């Protein structure tokens, strides 16, 4: 029952419960003449919520906040953007104005700046090298190396064994790596291997777009990227 594009009009956000205190958020957005669904994550931390990624735009992200208040009723106090693209940081100004402390790596903040995207307020240090991992509230943040972009981070929720791959991970139905303008195709499969080695216990893997699955999303991603590179 995971929602797809045809079930979410642009401007609306759905939440989907993955585990106790862990949800994905699903939004839709038009980009270059096509509508795409996009995922982020919500993780409970006591009486507060940690948000992973915006809902791809200001209006979507305002809707996201409204849907969180309706469905969950706990305040979002911090947010992390997992790379510099607009499906990840677009809506950060809305979050900030709402009183949410927004975060990203220094590299993500610099690339967002260069690209004219919204820029999270606070820098996440300790994630500059492939294999680096840091605790951030109820999650672990991991930099696997360059993949979909050079700055992409993944997020693990230890209490639930849930791995959110963001766009470094592709859904099982995918036949291609999608938008690779900022990608490092030579490194990507290695980056995926690092994730596989570091989170062998992951039970649910959530891609940046499309359906969640099991650990096979990781190998599938490496295979697609390799096949794409050719």
Task: Check 25, 53, 85, 182 and give the catalytic one.
Answer: 85
Q: Which of 53, 86, 87, 118 lies at the binding interface for Zn ion (CB under 5 A)? A: 87
The question of whether 122 is a catalytic residue gets the answer no
Beta strands at 122-123 and 76-80: parallel, antiparallel or unpaired: unpaired
The H or E element containing residue 68 is helix 58-71
Residue 112 contacts Zn ion per CB under 5 A = no
DSSP 3-state of 128: coil
Q: Least distance to Zn ion from the beta carbon of 88, Å?
A: 6
Task: Check 83, 86, 117, 152 and give the catalytic one.
Answer: 83
Q: Least distance to Zn ion from the beta carbon of 73, Å?
A: 29
Provide the CA 170 distance to its chain's centre, in angstroms. 11
The H or E element containing residue 34 is strand 34-45
Tokens in use for 227?
């096949």
Smaller CB distance to Zn ion: residue 67 or 182?
182
Smaller CB distance to Zn ion: residue 29 or 102?
29
The question of whether 39 is a catalytic residue gets the answer no
Residues 6+ apart with CB under 8 A from 64: 13, 25, 27, 54, 55, 91
Residue 53 contacts Zn ion per CB under 5 A = no
Among the listed ranges 15-23, 138-146, 165-173, 216-224, the one in contact with Zn ion (CB under 5 A) is 165-173
DSSP 3-state of 190: helix
Residue 166 contacts Zn ion per CB under 5 A = no
Contact footprint for Zn ion (CB under 5 A): 85, 87, 167
Catalogue the active-site residues. Answer: 83, 85, 87, 148, 179
């Amino acid at each position: 029952e995971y929602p797809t594009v045809n079930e979410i009009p642009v401007g609306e956000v759905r939440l989907y419960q993955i585990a106790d205190g862990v949800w994905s958020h699903i939004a839709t957005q038009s980009f270059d003449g096509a509508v795409y669904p996009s995922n982020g994550l919500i993780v409970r931390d006591g009486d507060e919520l940690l948000l992973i990624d915006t809902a791809w735009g200001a209006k979507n992200t305002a809707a996201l906040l409204a849907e969180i208040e309706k469905q969950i009723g706990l305040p979002v106090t911090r947010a992390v953007s997992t790379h510099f693209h607009d499906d990840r940081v677009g809506g950060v100004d809305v979050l900030r104005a709402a009183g949410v402390a927004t975060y990203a790596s220094p590299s993500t903040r610099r690339l967002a700046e260069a690209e004219g995207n919204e820029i999270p307020t606070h820098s996440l240090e300790g994630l500059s090298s492939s294999g680096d991992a840091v605790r951030f509230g109820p999650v672990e943040l991991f930099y696997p190396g360059a993949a979909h972009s050079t700055d992409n981070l993944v997020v693990y929720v230890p209490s639930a064994n849930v791995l959110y791959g963001g766009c470094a991970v592709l859904e099982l139905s995918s036949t291609s790596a999608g938008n690779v303008a900022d990608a490092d195709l030579a490194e990507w499969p290695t980056s995926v291997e690092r994730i596989q080695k570091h989170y062998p216990e992951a039970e649910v893997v959530i891609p940046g777009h499309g359906l969640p699955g099991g650990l096979d999303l990781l190998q599938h991603t490496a295979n697609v990227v390799k096949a794409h590179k050719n």
